């Protein structure tokens, strides 16, 4: 199956309260494996998964040096962007960066990403061609023209097409038993009377991996998407995820509604009925 | 591995 690696960067300015706070996390598929915080104590890249601890101290020294380098880069970018937008010198602002590569079942480069943001809005983004940039506002074109003259697209493509996929494949083999496994959902249904005339049927999905899951109610085959309460897929804290779905029912029509669980860990889609 | 090209923004 198609696997992924993606790093997330967050740099928040603290005007007068210190230096910008840099938080960095790395996610192979849906499993975090590295972490760095500038306001921490270790001041080092730290593992967050068992299959990455097997890497040598050299890995944990080069990753610490390289991830710290982006903290310095975003520090100056924070003031550069403040001037572009003419914001106050005492206000806090956030720069967010997402980049990563995608391999296929074979292990070959499928596609790569690079997206930057400012204050929760898009700023600049590397296109799919890995050769051109897309700016969102007129101040991001300042960055684009600078980055187009520095051939940043070439340099970023050299990582996404090279070092990225190389180490993603390495990470996948280091944790075969944890990354290339699928945990099917543990499904059950519950029934809560709202009154003596109505009730709430909830369809549950517990401890499943990965995150992608589709839960749908049907009334004699007709979808009930309009009359349904859906919650965001949420983590359990142990690497698996949770999701439950509710529908309000008449008193004596609980056996007309069916829940359908779709997940790649299930060889055949489940059908739950009360 | 980390490979974000920083070029000034």
């Amino acid at each position: 199956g198609s696997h992924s690696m993606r790093y997330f960067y967050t740099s928040v300015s603290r005007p007068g309260r210190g230096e910008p706070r840099f938080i960095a996390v790395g996610y192979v598929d849906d499993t975090q494996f590295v972490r760095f915080d500038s306001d921490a104590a270790s001041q080092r890249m730290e593992p967050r998964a068992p299959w990455i601890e097997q890497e040598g101290p050299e890995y944990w020294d080069q990753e610490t040096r390289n991830v710290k380098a982006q903290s310095q880069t975003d520090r100056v970018d924070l003031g550069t962007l403040r001037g572009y937008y003419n914001q106050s010198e005492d206000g806090s602002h956030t720069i967010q960066i997402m980049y990563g590569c995608d391999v296929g079942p074979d292990g070959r480069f499928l596609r790569g990403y690079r997206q930057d943001a400012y204050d929760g809005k898009d700023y600049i983004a590397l296109n799919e061609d890995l050769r051109s940039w897309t700016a969102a506002d007129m101040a991001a074109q300042i960055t684009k023209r600078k980055w187009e003259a520095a051939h940043a697209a070439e340099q970023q493509r050299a990582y996404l097409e090279g070092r990225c996929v190389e180490w993603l494949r390495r990470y996948l083999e280091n944790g075969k038993e944890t990354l290339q496994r699928t945990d099917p959902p543990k499904t059950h249904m519950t029934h809560h009377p709202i009154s003596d005339h109505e009730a709430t049927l909830r369809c549950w999905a517990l401890g499943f991996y990965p995150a992608e899951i589709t839960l749908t109610w049907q009334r004699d085959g007709e979808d009930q998407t309009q009359d349904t309460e859906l919650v965001e897929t949420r983590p359990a804290g142990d690497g698996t995820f949770q999701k439950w779905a509710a529908v309000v029912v008449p008193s004596g029509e609980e056996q007309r509604y069916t829940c359908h669980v779709q997940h790649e860990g299930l060889p055949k889609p489940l059908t739950l009925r009360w | 591995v980390v490979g974000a090209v920083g070029v000034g923004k």
Partner: antibody
Amino acid sequence: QKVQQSPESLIVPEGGMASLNCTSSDRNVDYFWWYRQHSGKSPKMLMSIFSNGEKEEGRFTVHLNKASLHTSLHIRDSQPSDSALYLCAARDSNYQLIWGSGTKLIIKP
Amino acid sequence: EAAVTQSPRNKVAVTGGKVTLSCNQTNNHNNMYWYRQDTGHGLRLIHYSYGAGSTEKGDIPDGYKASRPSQENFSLILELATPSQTSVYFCASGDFGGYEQYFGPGTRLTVLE
């Protein structure tokens, strides 16, 4: 010395072709460079390559085979303004550059 | 528009003296490096910096000191000069790989006894 350049000295006639080679011993190298230093001057980038294949810009042609970690500079139509030290570079497992000894081009007028 | 300057440009010193070589970039580059070129070794990294205030060691950092007081200035301090520190010293600036490392004019230091 991880980066090995050959030849050490090259006397090429004016108008001829000069092929310089460089090979790395560090397998974790994703980018290669070629820098030109005229006598008593500073190094300045000439070519860059990170993908397998060839890249032509003017009289200069650069080649790369990441399997053998081999880069090759081919200066055609040699002019006396190319007599310089040619340095090969390679991106580390870090993001620093590993520099080579250098090759001396002498273009006899 | 690359502007990497170096000062001093030529200097004679005595064994035991202090030689502080300075470099100045105006290209908003967070990475600055201090190289040294001798015959048979090419360019060899002494010290380098990833940003203002930071100073990291390179491959030949013994006998040399460094200081990055600002993003624009990077210094190489030879506290106790030795005759083995006679070389041509180059300072470079760049941006974390980084299409090009922009080199300075280079300083000719000859340490005599």
